[PDB]
């Protein structure tokens, strides 16, 4: 992230840090997540691309520190990693970035939602805030497009939304921005998300409870004059998600 607010597993209790292991003991941080039910996390597809193995991935719920154990945290097995059968990306954008991981306890059970371990509310049908709504994102993101270490303490920042009228313009992303993805930025060059941030929360609370409005996916450069941040609008994926969570 490029905002400015180190926070904790109590400010974004639904966030799931996602890790990939190695034959040689270690683990490295891939992308974020969002609890939905007890055993279902939900990220972006472009993360598990080059290494599509549900077996060599470990997932953390209830953890604020990057390369260090947060007491009262739950480690999971990704017992089922199904992605989106229409994901594709071009020389700029990414379409249909959304996947679901079904997790199970090393002991044999799902999430036991508690203070830190909490779940988000899905948005209803065709329902998104207006183009002014400040929403809030987080993640162990890159603190600079050029920077290369992922900050050690979970981050957070608020950002204003943007319209089709706005983003579709010439000095922006033209026709690369579609209707199944939200554009977001601050007045100019101050805040944004970034790499490492993907697969994690655009957060706006609607009608009371804070819901999963969007999901970080792409953008040219982190925090750039006339260059928003794009999130996969969960709005349209509502049936997809529900269609897999019950049977197949």
């Amino acid at each position: 992230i490029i905002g400015g607010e180190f926070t904790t597993i109590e400010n974004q209790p639904w966030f799931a840090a996602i890790y990939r292991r190695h034959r040689g003991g270690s683990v490295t941080y891939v992308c974020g997540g969002s609890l939905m039910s007890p055993c279902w996390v939900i990220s972006a597809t472009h993360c598990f691309i080059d290494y599509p193995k549900k077996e060599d991935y470990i997932v953390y719920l209830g953890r604020s520190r990057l390369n260090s154990n947060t007491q009262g945290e739950m480690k999971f097995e990704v017992e089922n990693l199904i992605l989106h059968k229409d994901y594709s990306a071009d020389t700029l954008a990414h379409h249909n970035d959304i996947a679901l991981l079904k997790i199970r306890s090393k002991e044999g059970r799902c999430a036991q939602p508690s203070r830190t371990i909490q779940t988000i509310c899905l948005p209803s049908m065709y329902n998104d805030p207006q183009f002014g709504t400040s929403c809030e994102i987080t993640g162990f993101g890159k603190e600079n497009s050029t920077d290369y270490l992922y900050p050690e303490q979970l981050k957070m920042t608020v950002v204003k939304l943007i319209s089709h009228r706005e983003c579709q313009q010439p000095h922006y992303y033209g026709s690369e921005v579609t209707t199944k993805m939200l554009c977001a930025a601050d007045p100019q060059w101050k805040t944004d998300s970034c790499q490492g941030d993907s697969g994690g929360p655009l957060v706006c609370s609607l009608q009371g409870r804070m819901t999963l409005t969007g999901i970080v996916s792409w953008g040219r450069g982190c925090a750039l004059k006339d260059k928003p941040g794009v999130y996969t609008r969960v709005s349209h994926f509502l049936p997809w998600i529900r269609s897999h969570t019950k049977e197949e």
């Binding site: 639904w14 203070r115 909490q118 779940t119 988000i120 509310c121 899905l122 804070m210």
Partner: peptide, 8 residues
């Protein structure tokens, strides 16, 4: 869901 605890 949307239940954000209070630790201020």
């Amino acid at each position: 869901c949307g239940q954000k605890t209070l630790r201020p």
